[PDB]
């Protein structure tokens, strides 16, 4: 028995192909605020994909508050993509509300093994300050998102690596180093979180250069990351996938 080149990944996206993500200059991204609420509240009893459904719910309901300006009453829609082949329960033991021991005993056999300590390494990579030939503005509130995820992933049991303000090369070179760390051999899962500007299929470095997301996922696939073979790998991508505002739709 052999493996496909890519499998066991779940990717959560803040916005849909072609649309754009909204961020609050004070309270952070809609997606991150919702992700950290639901994960923090329900990891104890709901698996990650179902959890991402609940984030969709919250994001579908939210609407923009900015009178005067072009963003008033605007909407947004998250989504997620999955090549997982089992439930992904994070089985928190503490920090956030823990799972009961009966819950594990009934759910463990049909789920990814998620028992190591740490549960995985986690990388949180935020670009807020852009300084290049493109028209990329300061990502106000990008710091709340960064510390929200760092605290969230620590509470959930992850050894959290962080990276701030990188060029597209530095993200390629350092995402690859992270992917090749030897701790993945014994940990049970993995989490990458990329927060930056971007376009459909790629995200910007602080130099206004682009890192294609297909190269990123490739670094963690079965051929390049044998230590994570058959292990669940989560990606959360906070970045625009376009440049158009969604004005929303009345409910007939």
């Amino acid at each position: 028995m052999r493996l496909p080149t890519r499998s066991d990944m779940i990717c959560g996206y803040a916005c849909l192909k072609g649309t754009a993500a909204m961020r609050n200059t004070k309270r952070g991204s809609w997606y991150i605020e919702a992700l950290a609420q639901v994960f923090s509240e329900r990891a104890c009893d709901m698996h990650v994909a179902d959890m991402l459904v609940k984030v969709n719910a919250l994001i579908k309901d939210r609407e923009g508050y900015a009178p005067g300006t072009e963003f008033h009453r605007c909407k947004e829609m998250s989504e997620y993509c999955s090549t997982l082949c089992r439930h992904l329960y994070l089985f928190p033991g503490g920090g956030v509300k823990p799972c009961t021991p009966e819950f594990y005993q009934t759910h463990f056999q049909l789920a990814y093994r998620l028992q190591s300590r740490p549960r995985g390494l986690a990388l949180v990579l935020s670009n807020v300050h852009f300084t290049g030939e493109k028209e990329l503005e300061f990502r106000s509130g990008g710091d709340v998102d960064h510390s929200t995820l760092v605290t969230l992933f620590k509470l959930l049991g992850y050894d959290v690596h962080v990276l701030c303000d990188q060029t597209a090369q530095e993200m390629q070179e350092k995402l690859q180093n992270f992917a090749q760390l030897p701790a993945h051999r014994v940990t049970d899962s993995c989490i990458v979180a990329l927060l930056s500007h971007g376009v459909e299929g790629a995200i910007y470095g602080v130099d206004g250069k682009l890192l294609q997301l297909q190269e990123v996922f490739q670094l963690f696939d079965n051929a390049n990351c044998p230590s994570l073979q058959n292990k669940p790998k989560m990606f959360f991508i906070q970045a625009c996938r376009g440049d158009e505002t969604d004005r929303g739709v009345d409910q007939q």
């Binding site: 803040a14 916005c15 754009a20 993500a21 909204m22 961020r23 609050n24 200059t25 004070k26 991204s29 923009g64 508050y65 900015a66 300006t69 963003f71 008033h72 605007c74 503005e137 990502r139 106000s140 509130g141 500007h197 971007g198 906070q238 970045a239 625009c240 440049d243 505002t245």
Partner: peptide, 5 residues
């Protein structure tokens, strides 16, 4: 209060 990504 709302800015795009």
């Amino acid at each position: 209060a709302x800015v795009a990504x």
